[PDB]
Structures are given as C-alpha cells and as structure tokens.
Design an enzyme around this catalytic site. Sequence first.
Site, PDB file in Angstrom:
ATOM      1  N   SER A  44       0.825  -1.203   0.000  1.00  0.00           N
ATOM      2  CA  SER A  44       0.000   0.000   0.000  1.00  0.00           C
ATOM      3  C   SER A  44       0.861   1.256   0.000  1.00  0.00           C
ATOM      4  O   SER A  44       1.950   1.272   0.585  1.00  0.00           O
ATOM      5  CB  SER A  44      -0.909   0.032   1.227  1.00  0.00           C
ATOM      6  OG  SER A  44      -0.170   0.209   2.430  1.00  0.00           O
ATOM      7  N   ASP A  45       0.358   2.322  -0.615  1.00  0.00           N
ATOM      8  CA  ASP A  45       0.889   3.661  -0.337  1.00  0.00           C
ATOM      9  C   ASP A  45       0.549   3.983   1.140  1.00  0.00           C
ATOM     10  O   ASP A  45      -0.231   3.275   1.777  1.00  0.00           O
ATOM     11  CB  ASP A  45       0.333   4.701  -1.322  1.00  0.00           C
ATOM     12  CG  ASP A  45       1.307   5.856  -1.596  1.00  0.00           C
ATOM     13  OD1 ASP A  45       2.203   6.121  -0.747  1.00  0.00           O
ATOM     14  OD2 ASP A  45       1.145   6.512  -2.667  1.00  0.00           O
ATOM     15  N   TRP A  46       1.172   5.013   1.689  1.00  0.00           N
ATOM     16  CA  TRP A  46       1.167   5.231   3.131  1.00  0.00           C
ATOM     17  C   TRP A  46      -0.172   5.848   3.547  1.00  0.00           C
ATOM     18  O   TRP A  46      -0.406   6.999   3.253  1.00  0.00           O
ATOM     19  CB  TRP A  46       2.336   6.135   3.531  1.00  0.00           C
ATOM     20  CG  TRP A  46       3.636   5.419   3.850  1.00  0.00           C
ATOM     21  CD1 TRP A  46       4.415   5.637   4.947  1.00  0.00           C
ATOM     22  CD2 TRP A  46       4.301   4.389   3.089  1.00  0.00           C
ATOM     23  NE1 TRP A  46       5.520   4.822   4.914  1.00  0.00           N
ATOM     24  CE2 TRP A  46       5.474   4.046   3.790  1.00  0.00           C
ATOM     25  CE3 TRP A  46       4.019   3.719   1.890  1.00  0.00           C
ATOM     26  CZ2 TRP A  46       6.362   3.076   3.337  1.00  0.00           C
ATOM     27  CZ3 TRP A  46       4.918   2.749   1.437  1.00  0.00           C
ATOM     28  CH2 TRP A  46       6.072   2.443   2.165  1.00  0.00           C
TER      29      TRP A  46
END
Length: 842
Positions: free
Chosen positions: A260-262
């Site tokens: 995932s992106d943050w």
Amino acid sequence: SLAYSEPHYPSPWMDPKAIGWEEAYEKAKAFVSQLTLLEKVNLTTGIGWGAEQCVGQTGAIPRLGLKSMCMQDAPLAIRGTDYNSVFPAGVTTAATFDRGLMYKRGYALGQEAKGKGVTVLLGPVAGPLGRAPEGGRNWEGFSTDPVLTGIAMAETIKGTQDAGVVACAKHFIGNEQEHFRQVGESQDYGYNISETLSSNIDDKTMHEMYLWPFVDAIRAGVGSFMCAYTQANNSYSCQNSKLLNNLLKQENGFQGFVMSDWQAHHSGVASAAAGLDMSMPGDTMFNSGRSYWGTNLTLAVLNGTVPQWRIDDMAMRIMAAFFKVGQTVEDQEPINFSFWTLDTYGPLHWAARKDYQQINWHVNVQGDHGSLIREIAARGTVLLKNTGSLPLKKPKFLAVIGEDAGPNPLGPNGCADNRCNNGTLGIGWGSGTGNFPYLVTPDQALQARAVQDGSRYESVLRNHAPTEIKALVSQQDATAIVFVNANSGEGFIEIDGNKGDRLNLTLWNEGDALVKNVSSWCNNTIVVLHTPGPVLLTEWYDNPNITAILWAGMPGQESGNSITDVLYGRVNPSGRTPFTWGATRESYGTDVLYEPNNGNEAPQLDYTEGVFIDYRHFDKANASVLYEFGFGLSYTTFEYSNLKIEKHQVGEYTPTTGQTEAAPTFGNFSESVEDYVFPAAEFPYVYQFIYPYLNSTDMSASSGDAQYGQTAEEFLPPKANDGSAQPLLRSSGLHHPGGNPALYDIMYTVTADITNTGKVAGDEVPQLYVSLGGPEDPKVVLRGFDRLRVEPGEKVQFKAVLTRRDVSSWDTVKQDWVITEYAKKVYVGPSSRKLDLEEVLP
Ligand SMILES: *[C@@H]1O[C@H](CO)[C@@H](O[C@@H]2O[C@H](CO)[C@@H](O[C@@H]3O[C@H](CO[C@H]4O[C@H](CO[C@H]5O[C@H](CO)[C@@H](O)[C@H](O)[C@@H]5O[C@H]5O[C@H](CO)[C@@H](O)[C@H](O)[C@@H]5O)[C@@H](O)[C@H](O[C@H]5O[C@H](CO)[C@@H](O)[C@H](O)[C@@H]5O)[C@@H]4O)[C@@H](O)[C@H](O[C@H]4O[C@H](CO)[C@@H](O)[C@H](O)[C@@H]4O[C@H]4O[C@H](CO)[C@@H](O)[C@H](O)[C@@H]4O)[C@@H]3O)[C@H](O)[C@H]2NC(C)=O)[C@H](O)[C@H]1NC(C)=O
Ligand SMILES: *[C@@H]1O[C@H](CO)[C@@H](O[C@@H]2O[C@H](CO)[C@@H](O[C@@H]3O[C@H](CO[C@H]4O[C@H](CO)[C@@H](O)[C@H](O[C@H]5O[C@H](CO)[C@@H](O)[C@H](O)[C@@H]5O)[C@@H]4O)[C@@H](O)[C@H](O[C@H]4O[C@H](CO)[C@@H](O)[C@H](O)[C@@H]4O[C@H]4O[C@H](CO)[C@@H](O)[C@H](O)[C@@H]4O[C@H]4O[C@H](CO)[C@@H](O)[C@H](O)[C@@H]4O)[C@@H]3O)[C@H](O)[C@H]2NC(C)=O)[C@H](O)[C@H]1NC(C)=O
Ligand SMILES: *[C@@H]1O[C@H](CO)[C@@H](O[C@@H]2O[C@H](CO)[C@@H](O[C@@H]3O[C@H](CO[C@H]4O[C@H](CO[C@H]5O[C@H](CO)[C@@H](O)[C@H](O)[C@@H]5O[C@H]5O[C@H](CO)[C@@H](O)[C@H](O)[C@@H]5O)[C@@H](O)[C@H](O[C@H]5O[C@H](CO)[C@@H](O)[C@H](O)[C@@H]5O)[C@@H]4O)[C@@H](O)[C@H](O[C@H]4O[C@H](CO)[C@@H](O)[C@H](O)[C@@H]4O)[C@@H]3O)[C@H](O)[C@H]2NC(C)=O)[C@H](O)[C@H]1NC(C)=O
Ligand SMILES: *[C@@H]1O[C@H](CO)[C@@H](O[C@@H]2O[C@H](CO)[C@@H](O[C@@H]3O[C@H](CO[C@H]4O[C@H](CO)[C@@H](O)[C@H](O[C@H]5O[C@H](CO)[C@@H](O)[C@H](O)[C@@H]5O)[C@@H]4O)[C@@H](O)[C@H](O[C@H]4O[C@H](CO)[C@@H](O)[C@H](O)[C@@H]4O)[C@@H]3O)[C@H](O)[C@H]2NC(C)=O)[C@H](O)[C@H]1NC(C)=O
Ligand SMILES: *[C@@H]1O[C@H](CO)[C@@H](O[C@@H]2O[C@H](CO)[C@@H](O[C@@H]3O[C@H](CO)[C@@H](O)[C@H](O[C@H]4O[C@H](CO)[C@@H](O)[C@H](O)[C@@H]4O)[C@@H]3O)[C@H](O)[C@H]2NC(C)=O)[C@H](O)[C@H]1NC(C)=O
Ligand SMILES: *[C@@H]1O[C@H](CO)[C@@H](O[C@@H]2O[C@H](CO)[C@@H](O[C@@H]3O[C@H](CO)[C@@H](O)[C@H](O)[C@@H]3O)[C@H](O)[C@H]2NC(C)=O)[C@H](O)[C@H]1NC(C)=O
Ligand SMILES: *[C@@H]1O[C@H](CO)[C@@H](O[C@@H]2O[C@H](CO)[C@@H](O)[C@H](O)[C@H]2NC(C)=O)[C@H](O)[C@H]1NC(C)=O
Ligand SMILES: *[C@@H]1O[C@H](CO)[C@@H](O)[C@H](O)[C@H]1NC(C)=O
Ligand SMILES: *[C@@H]1O[C@H](CO)[C@@H](O)[C@H](O)[C@H]1NC(C)=O
Ligand SMILES: *[C@@H]1O[C@H](CO)[C@@H](O)[C@H](O)[C@H]1NC(C)=O
Ligand SMILES: *[C@@H]1O[C@H](CO)[C@@H](O)[C@H](O)[C@H]1NC(C)=O
Ligand SMILES: *[C@@H]1O[C@H](CO)[C@@H](O)[C@H](O)[C@H]1NC(C)=O
C-alpha cells in the site's frame, strides 16, 4: 452512472515456473515453509509510522535471523538521510531518450540504497503518467508517452535490482493529480469529501496508455508494486480486485508483492482478498496504534476469513522479491540511518521515544555518482531555440539574471521535504526527494567558467530588480542569461495556493515579466527554464532578442555544472522534450480537477479524452503547439534518409489456454489460541507499535473491531476464498509475466540512415512512430527511439524493432490484443512532427 469496478477473484498465487522467478520461488518456498502464522503476519504488516528507522518497516523474524525489511523513498535519491546523492528527476531522465543513462541512474540509486541498508527502494514512477500538465507529481515519473515511460521504467528497474535492492513500480493506478488524493488532507484544505478521487478509465485506454508502462516494469522483473491512494471506478486501488487480481496478477502474471501507499490501505480482509500483500506503514492511519492487518490478520487466518493459501502467498511474494534481487537472510546490510532525525544518537523507536542508541552511522554512499548526475542532466537538457548565440565561446560579458540562478539563502536543505521555491530548482517538493550533499547553482559554475576564460561576470540573483537588471543587461555586448522556474510536488505541501498540483502553467516568481523585461533591454537574451513540466512560452518565445531557450527540468545536485556544459558546448545537446509545449492551457485538452464534483462524496475523474493526452491530443485536434513531443535542437544538424522495413515471419497469435495449479500452503500453524497472545514476560509492548499478537484469547475483543463476527461468504464477493485451480486468461502468458509471450514476437525490423551535415560531433535522437490507421487511433504513436553519436560528415544506422504488441490494439470485446485491418504506416525522424521518412508496413 456511478462508475463500477467488477469483482475478480480469487487473488492469484505465485507460479513456481514463472521465468525469471523460478529460483526466487524456491528460496521463498524453503523460507516461508518454516514460518509460524505470527511470523508471516510480521512480514506482511508494517510496524507503524515512526516505529523505527525507515519510512516503512516490516516485522522481523529473529528466530530465522531475518532483520526487518526497510522501505525507503525516493525515486531520485535516498530520502531523509546524509552523504547520499540527489539524481535528476524522472522527467529530466526521460528527456535523455538514453537507455544506458536510465540504467546507470537506476543502478547508482540502488547502490546508494543498498549501502544504507534499504531493502526496497520506492521507485520508479509510471503513475502519474501525465494526464494533465498541472499534475503536481508528474516530474517524478517519466513522460506522457507510454512507450518512453515503459522503457524508462524497465531500464531504471533493471539497474536498481542489479545493484541488489527491490524496486517498486508506483503508483498503481490513476493517481494523476494531487487534489482529492486523501480524505484527511483534503478536509484540512477545506474540501469536505468522504472518500478519495475516483479515476474512471475505460478498458482500452487502460491497456494502451496507463497500464502499458507498468507491464514493461513487470517484464523487467520488478519485485514490487505500490497501489495508489485514489480509487479506480469507486473501489480503492489497494482493495481493487480488477486492478490487483485481474490486470496485474492474472493478465500480466505479476509474481512480486503489492504494498500500500502510506495510509492507502483502508480494510483488512477485503484488501488481502483483493490482491494486497503488504500494509505500509502498517497502522490504520499514522500513529493510530492499530492495524487493518497485524493482530487483525492473525485473527482472520485463525477464524477462516483469510485462507492459509492467501497469507502464505503474500509472504511468498514478499520473500521471492527479496531473494530475486540477491538479498540473503544471512548477510543483510544493517539499517545504518534514521529517517526521523540526522542526530547520531536518538531513540531507535522514534514515535515511542524509547531505546536510545546510535541510530545514524553517516555512511557515505555517494561514490562517484556526482559526475554521472552531471552527465544525465546535461543529456536531458532540451535546446528549444537557438538563433546562433549558442554555444558560448569566450564571451566578453555574461550577465546572469534570476533567483533560480542562485542559492537558497537558507541552504539547499533548509526546508523540510524541499518545500521552498527559493534559489535554484534542483528537484520539486514532497516524498520524491532527498537531501543534497551539495547543490551547484548556475551562478557558481558560470562565474568560475567566466573567470577561467577572462570573461566579465555579474549576476543579479533576484527576479524583481528592474533598475539594477536594466542597468546591467542594457550595456554593450551583454550576454544575458535568465534563469526562471516553476515548481510543484506532493499534495501534503502547499506553496502560495499550489496544493501539490500547479494552479497554472505560468512561470513562478514573476518569471514571465522578468524574461519580457530582459529581452526588451538586451538583444542577446538566453532563457533557461527549470520546470517540472511545460509552461506557456507563447507571449515571449518569438522575440528575436531571445536568441536561445533551454529547458533543464529538475537536474538534481550538479545543476550549475550540467547547464554550463551545455551552454559552452562541452556537451552538444541531444535531449528531447518528453511532453508538448502548448500555446495555451486549453490546448492540452485535459486539466486538473480543483473542485469536488460529486457533492461530499468521492470526486469523479472521468478520463473521457481516452488515449488522447499530450501529443496525441495536439495532433488529433490540431491544437496549437509551440514545441512538439520529441523536439530538441543540437549545435550540429542531421539529415534522414534510406528508410527500410524488413517483414519477419511469425506464427499466429494463439490464445493462452489451460489451468493454474491449485493454491498451495507452506507449513502449518497451531490451533491453540493461547499461543498467539502477546509475550509480555519476553519484551515490553512499545507505544503505537504494530504487532501480530492478540492481547487475549477472546478473539472478538482482541480485534477491537466493532463489526467483528462475519464470514467471507457474507461480506466478500464470490470466489474470494477459492483455492482451486483457475483457468488462464487468453491475454496472459503461460509462465511468462507481462502477457502472452507472442505479443513480444518481432514482426518488423526498421532501419534508416542519419548523416551529421554540420561542423561538430553530436548525438541524435531518431524516433520511430506508427500510425495504427483506425479512425479512433492517434495520428502517430511513439514505438521506438535511440541516442546515437555521429561525427561531422559521418553516416550512422538507426535500427529499431516493432513487436506484435507495438502494432496491436486492445479489443475490449475479445479481451485481447488484435492487429486491426487498417493500413499501418511507419515514420522516422528527429521529432513527433518532423516525420521525414515514411513507409507503409508490408
Ligand atoms: C501562476 O501561479 C504562480 C504561483 O502561484 C503565481 O506566481 C505568483 O505571482 C505573484 C504575482 O506576480 C507573485 O507575488 C508578487 O511578488 C512581487 C515581487 O515581490 C518581491 O519584490 C517586491 C518589490 O521589490 C522591489 O521594491 C522593494 C521595496 O520597494 C525593494 O526592497 C526591492 O529590492 C525591489 O526594488 C527594486 O524594484 C523597484 C520597483 O519594483 C525599483 O524601484 C528598485 O530600484 C529596485 O529595482 C518586494 O516588495 C516583495 O517583498 C514582499 O514580500 C516579501 C516576502 O518574500 C516580504 O519579505 C516583504 O516584507 C514584502 O511584503 C518581494 O521581495 C510583488 O511585487 C507583488 O506584490 C504586489 O501584488 C501583491 C498581490 O498579492 C500585493 O499584495 C502587493 O501589495 C503588491 O501589489 C501591487 O502590485 C500589483 C502587481 O502590479 C497590483 O496588482 C496591486 O494592485 C498593487 O499595485 C506580489 O507579492 C508571487 O511571488 C508568485 N508566487 C510564486 C510562488 O512564485 C502567478 O502569478 C500565477 N500566474 C497567473 C497569471 O495566474
Ligand atoms: C472501469 O469501468 C469501465 C467501464 O465499464 C471498465 O471498462 C470495461 O471493462 C470490462 C472488462 O473489465 C469490459 O468488459 C467486456 O465487455 C465486452 C462487451 O463489450 C461491449 O459491450 C459493452 C456493454 O454494452 C460496451 O460498453 C462495450 O463498448 C466499448 O467498446 C466498443 C468497441 O468494442 C466501443 O465502441 C465503445 O465506445 C466502448 O469503449 C462493447 O461494445 C465483453 O465481450 C467482455 O466479455 C469477455 O470477457 C469477460 C471478462 O471480463 C468474460 O467473462 C466473458 O466471458 C468474455 O470473454 C469470453 O469471450 C470472448 C469473446 O466473445 C473471448 O475472446 C474470451 O476469451 C472469453 O472466452 C471464454 O468463453 C468462451 C465461450 O463464451 C470460451 O470458448 C472460452 O474458452 C472462454 O472461457 C467483457 O465483459 C467492458 O467492455 C469495458 N467497457 C469499456 C467502455 O471500456 C473498466 O474495466 C473499469 N476499470 C476498473 C479498474 O474497474
Ligand atoms: C475474523 O477476523 C477478522 C479480522 O478481525 C474480522 O474482519 C472484519 O470483518 C468485518 C465483518 O464482520 C469487516 O467489516 C465489513 O467490511 C466490509 C468491507 O469493507 C471494506 O470494503 C467496502 C467496499 O466493499 C466492496 O468492495 C470490497 C473490495 O474492495 C469487497 O470485499 C466487498 O465485498 C464489496 O464488494 C462490492 O464492491 C466491489 C467493488 O466495487 C465489487 O467488485 C463487488 O462485486 C461488490 O459489488 C468499503 O465500503 C469499506 O469502506 C468503509 O470502511 C472503511 C474502513 O474499513 C472506511 O475507510 C471507509 O470510509 C468506509 O467507511 C471497506 O473498505 C464491509 O462491506 C462491511 O460493510 C457492510 O456490512 C456492515 C455491517 O457489518 C454495514 O454496516 C455496512 O453498511 C455494509 O453493509 C463491513 O464493514 C471488517 O472490515 C473486518 N476487519 C478487518 C480488519 O478486516 C472478521 O469479522 C472475523 N470473522 C469471524 C467469523 O470471526
Ligand atoms: C515480529 O516483529 C517484531 C518487531 O520487529 C518483533 O518484536 C521484537 O522482538 C525482539 C526479539 O524477540 C525484541 O528484542 C528484545 O527486546 C528485549 C527487551 O528490550 C528492552 O527492554 C530491556 C529491559 O528493560 C532493555 O534493556 C532494552 O534496552 C536495551 O536494548 C535497546 C534496544 O536495542 C537499546 O536501545 C538500549 O540502549 C538497551 O541496550 C529494551 O528497552 C531485550 O531484552 C532482548 O534482548 C535479548 O537478546 C540479548 C542479546 O541480543 C540478550 O542479552 C537478552 O538476554 C535477551 O535474550 C531483545 O533485544 C524487540 O523488543 C521486539 N520489538 C518490539 C518493538 O517490541 C517480534 O519478536 C516478531 N515476532 C515474531 C514471532 O517473529
Ligand atoms: C482491527 O481492525 C479494525 C478495523 O477493521 C480496527 O478498528 C478501528 O480502529 C480505529 C483506530 O483505533 C478506530 O478509529 C478511531 O476511533 C477513535 C474514536 O473512538 C478516534 O479517536 C480515531 O480518530 C483518529 O482519526 C481522526 C481523524 O478523523 C483524528 O481526529 C483522531 O485524532 C485520530 O487520529 C479513529 O477514528 C475505528 O473506529 C475502528 N473501527 C471499528 C469498526 O471498530 C482495530 O483497531 C484493529 N485492531 C487492531 C488490534 O489493530
Ligand atoms: C531588443 O534589444 C534592444 C537592445 O539591445 C532594444 O533596443 C533598444 O530599444 C529601446 C526602446 O526603444 C531604446 O531605448 C530608448 O528609448 C527612448 C524612448 O523614450 C528613446 O528616446 C532613446 O533614444 C532610446 O532609443 C534603445 O535605444 C534601443 N537600444 C539599442 C542598442 O538599439 C530593442 O528594443 C529590443 N527589441 C525587442 C523587440 O525586445
Ligand atoms: C545586438 O545589437 C548590436 C547593435 O545594437 C549588434 O552589434 C553589431 O554586430 C555586428 C556583428 O554581428 C557588427 O559588425 C556591428 O558592427 C555591431 N554594431 C554595433 C553598433 O555594435 C549585435 O550583433 C547584436 N547582437 C546579436 C546577438 O544579434
Ligand atoms: C461534511 O459533509 C457531511 C455530509 O457528508 C456533513 O455531515 C459534515 O458536517 C461536513 N463537515 C463539516 C466539517 O462541516
Ligand atoms: C523563502 O524563505 C522564506 C523564509 O525565510 C519563506 O517564508 C518563503 O516562503 C520562501 N519562499 C518560497 C517561494 O518558498
Ligand atoms: C518590468 O519592467 C517594468 C517597467 O520597465 C517594471 O515596472 C516592472 O516592475 C518590471 N517587472 C519585473 C518582474 O522586473
Ligand atoms: C493544423 O494547423 C496548422 C496551423 O497550426 C495548419 O497550417 C494546418 O493546415 C492544420 N492542419 C489540418 C487542419 O489538418
Ligand atoms: C492491546 O494492548 C495495548 C496495551 O499494550 C493497548 O494499548 C491496545 O489498545 C490493546 N488492543 C486492543 C485491541 O485491545
């Protein structure tokens, strides 16, 4: 009418015979089979924001000697540390049109990453592609063109992974703008939206434009993908089964892991079933102390909602990526920096403020990457205009003008995440950055050159000083060199109303009025542009007093030396603009969406333009172009002749058929719920840290999830837990990531001659375009290129191949690539509009 994302299940499992991955698969199998459930969950779940040293980290498996994996920004530099290099941005790299330089940059980056203890470097970037030029983060990527970008992704990845570090293709997919990318961030900017922007992309446009460069990343062997913040047809990318399961893991047979992106991961079981493999940074939101995975993932395996085959596959993908690039469990390079501070000593556990020790070793990983950076930036500098004033040779009097020529008075790293437009523009702002070891300004390099030559040199390092500037540049024989910029970046930073994305396509800091004033006062005005993308040159570019214009992009640490090399002809420019310089904002035909368009719900970004962005739009609409895609001048000239096309015999494009294996399981796990309880007499529970353990044997209370208790059947779509053998897609390649291998069959070899008809040696960038011939097809599309050295008078051969994929069209009815019946033509020339040589495909 609300855009919809189809269910595609089950989440495909790794193929032990996938070429490139066979040896990695077996090492992953031998490791993963030894693991307990808690240890597998430790691999897949980040330890939380600020938990230890890197931007993101996994749990460790200290029973088997595996140290926590370090995920570290950025695509052009190791972020948030010291004694590293800052390389040119992707857009400047793309402008080189030079495969070797793209590889070398990738390799050097990987070397620096490896030397710091980084496991996964968070780059390169094929999303954003560049749907609209105002896109705040376009500069991190390569080009609006899918072929150039795809090639740049592949070369960069091969380099990084040859250096021993996992690369990460991001952001997948449809994060073309910063506006409305995140809910909290939007809300704090005064936009009351309940979910992030949804990119609504038709299937053909997806295959032929946005997906294309990520497929090149897959075929180059990229170890990981990062799913995007934004939605795709109103399903978030990190739980979008059409994206992760179908397009990525089924059609294109991706064998690596998806992180995932943050704060882009919004649900536990649903995301895992939809294709997510790693939750970064691990917590629900930054510093929440809770996780959609961790404990919750442990419980979901224990309660049956997540099958063992699924979690086993996540760990297999993560470990196989690790082993593919040559990392070993024995000889891991220790993490020798801390992202959260430059202090030598501080808390290992930063958010918790505990375990004080040495956290920065200040390791020098720069090597000789300085000169490589200087070279790449010079080769990616685009000479847009030159009436004879360049190259410079022993000029009598240089007057260097503009704040962008000079230093940031608070230093090149004075502002966190490079969030100022003070001084020269080395790179943009946001996470796609790092700390400069130094930043050579134009003013330093041009002065030193002038002094060496006996040239007079004066500089005014402000954009608003008309009295002083006029008095300087209006003197006899002045060569006025005006440095001006525009800036943009990631959405968490805002400068003067520019919230990541650019508000407009003008120069910043009164740049346009500076250039009009100087050119009105001095008949030898040279303009250098440092921009992340195009600006509108329309009002001043045609002034004959402006004898030259250069776009130098975001050159990184050696800016001043790179531009001086080109200005004085130590490098003869060859770089080509990787986007179009339009006459107006509207001529582009796309724009950023600055205002929510769906009430307080998810804004809707409909990609109605289809594949017609940048030059495809300009050519089809015949909109006003100042400088076309692939345009760039040299201090010599080149002539094109002798186009030839050789037809290859190929077999028929055969649909892929058959079944996958049944989903395997690796090892087993205890059925005693007491074995998963937090080991409190072994080590303390660290504040906000994300763990796999349960707090007690009450599974429901251990979840802390007010909705706990439902089964897969009642909240996930059909086949989410189906571990039986699955039919293969006809567009997929059997054991061949990146689609049916018959797509990469060479159908034509194209050749042409290039003669250097001027006085000096120089590189040329011949380009190969194709007209696919349909009424809905672009006039021309880039299909190849090269960068070739030619001596004065010499003739050199440009050679390029066309694959089956290169002459095909996505047929959404068939769900495969077809070669349409329309006549196709081939063009070769020095730009997208200088189509010198033409021939029909035989
Ligand atoms: C696309 O997007 C872009 C990005 O968002 C956007 O870019 C932005 O554009 C705006 C608009 O152009 C920019 O903001 C402007 O900046 C101007 C320059 O500011 C600096 O210089 C000023 C003038 O300096 C001279 O005079 C000083 C004292 O008198 C001396 O100290 C200087 O040495 C200098 O002297 C020289 O020049 C004299 C003549 O000018 C000459 O006699 C003398 O001999 C010598 O040669 C400084 O005053 C100014 O200082 C301010 O800000 C700093 C912070 O950096 C503070 O430290 C200071 O305390 C001080 O507050 C800067 O150093 C400004 O002139 C301009 O101000 C005018 O407009 C604003 C609008 O908000 C007004 O608030 C302000 O009062 C001024 O109003 C007057 O003029 C305007 C314009 O003509 C007029 O409309 C108005 O009605 C009124 O008459 C403004 O702030 C901005 O910087 C850009 N942003 C970025 C991020 O780069 C772009 O516009 C977009 N484009 C489009 C088309 O949409
Ligand atoms: C975001 O939303 C987007 C908009 O919805 C979405 O885009 C859509 O993506 C889906 C795929 O995910 C596409 O679905 C396909 O639809 C096909 C029919 O398309 C026609 O009808 C549509 C509905 O009215 C039209 O909208 C569509 O118009 C579009 O294209 C036109 C030109 O063609 C153009 O003029 C329009 O402007 C517009 O752009 C079009 O007219 C349908 O055929 C296809 O079905 C196949 O694939 C399915 C998998 O998705 C299979 O389940 C299904 O069985 C079909 O495959 C089988 O049959 C094929 C041939 O008939 C074979 O080639 C296959 O191999 C396969 O064969 C199996 O079965 C055989 C026996 O039947 C057997 O022998 C074989 O062995 C094998 O088992 C599919 O449903 C949709 O068209 C897209 N729409 C648009 C507008 O782009 C986008 O994906 C979304 N994005 C995200 C991220 O969610
Ligand atoms: C075992 O232990 C585990 C771990 O502790 C327990 O796991 C928990 O189980 C509960 C249920 O008991 C879970 O809550 C439920 O979550 C689901 C999913 O929520 C997320 O996705 C929503 C979108 O759903 C669509 O798409 C996803 C794929 O992305 C798909 O799985 C769904 O089936 C659904 O599919 C449809 O749409 C697809 C995409 O278009 C199509 O392809 C497809 O064909 C379908 O049409 C999303 O809305 C939701 O977003 C909300 O929540 C997040 C926070 O999570 C927030 O960020 C957003 O802003 C939204 O607020 C999630 O992202 C959800 O659908 C359930 O909701 C229904 O039921 C509840 C009642 O519980 C109603 O109130 C709702 O209105 C709705 O009807 C529900 O919330 C929980 O998430 C899960 N926890 C973890 C950590 O995983 C499990 O219970 C244990 N089991 C046992 C037996 O012990
Ligand atoms: C999943 O992933 C997570 C996260 O990676 C794993 O959790 C971590 O597990 C490891 C190993 O199991 C834990 O390390 C142990 O920590 C204890 C406790 O240390 C703390 O408290 C001590 C007592 O007050 C204190 O002395 C410590 O302070 C010293 O150490 C710190 C840290 O380096 C340092 O900064 C200080 O200056 C001090 O020097 C600290 O506050 C510790 O006692 C353990 O030591 C063992 O090994 C040493 C030799 O190496 C030996 O001498 C000891 O006798 C002992 O046997 C060990 O370091 C770690 O704390 C966990 N992390 C967190 C954040 O909780 C988890 O294990 C993974 N699970 C699975 C199943 O894999
Ligand atoms: C297992 O997963 C479940 C979800 O599937 C997870 O439950 C969720 O935990 C979060 C985080 O603790 C809960 O959300 C919090 O609710 C409290 C109020 O009671 C708020 O204080 C929190 O607000 C944050 O964000 C706000 C911005 O809107 C900030 O203003 C504020 O300062 C905080 O930063 C936060 O919203 C959520 O309610 C539950 N969900 C459910 C359905 O119960 C659980 O924690 C996971 N378990 C483990 C052990 O990790
Ligand atoms: C290109 O640059 C040249 C300078 O190299 C510019 O020429 C200069 O033009 C100005 C304005 O016309 C002249 O200045 C003075 O104008 C006043 C008007 O009040 C006049 O009375 C003075 O006699 C004087 O002419 C200046 O002389 C002239 N300089 C030279 C060396 O020719 C030119 O205008 C620029 N052109 C463009 C299109 O930007
Ligand atoms: C700028 O204008 C000046 C005149 O204002 C030009 O100077 C002339 O240059 C030629 C050579 O090209 C000489 O033979 C003349 O004697 C010069 N005249 C004067 C009055 O100095 C100068 O060349 C122009 N610069 C550019 C770059 O075009
Ligand atoms: C945001 O919109 C919702 C409706 O979706 C509304 O209930 C809420 O009050 C709004 N937020 C604020 C801060 O006013
Ligand atoms: C330049 O630095 C000052 C702080 O001294 C800051 O206020 C200003 O915003 C910076 N300028 C830009 C354009 O970022
Ligand atoms: C440009 O010149 C005019 C008049 O010569 C002056 O009033 C204006 O402020 C100048 N602008 C800049 C950016 O130097
Ligand atoms: C496209 O525009 C140019 C001017 O920019 C014009 O000369 C040319 O004829 C146009 N071509 C068309 C409409 O096909
Ligand atoms: C688990 O225990 C910690 C204390 O170590 C507490 O802060 C956390 O909220 C607990 N989690 C749940 C789900 O009760």
